[PDB]
């Protein structure tokens, strides 16, 4: 889920 993850 995003945003939150390292890719967000």
Q: Can you count the beta strands?
A: 0
Biggest sheet statistics: none
Portion in strands:
under 5%
| Rg computed from alpha carbons, rounded to a whole number of angstroms | 4 Å
Query: Helical proportion?
Result: under 10%
Number of helices: 0
The helix/strand class is: little secondary structure
Task: Give the N-terminus to C-terminus distance in angstroms.
Answer: 9 Å
Shape, per Cα inertia axes: elongated
Provide a brief overview of the structure.
0% of the residues lie in helices and 0% in strands. The protein contains no helices and no strands. Disulfide bonds join 2-8.
Structure description:
The chain has 8 residues and is mostly loops. The chain has no helix or strand. The chain is elongated. The termini are close together.
What is the topology?
Elements: no helix or strand
Modified residues (D-tryptophan): 4
Disulfide bonds: 2-8
Protein name: Contryphan-Lo
Characteristic terms for this protein:
8 residues; little secondary structure; Contryphan-Lo
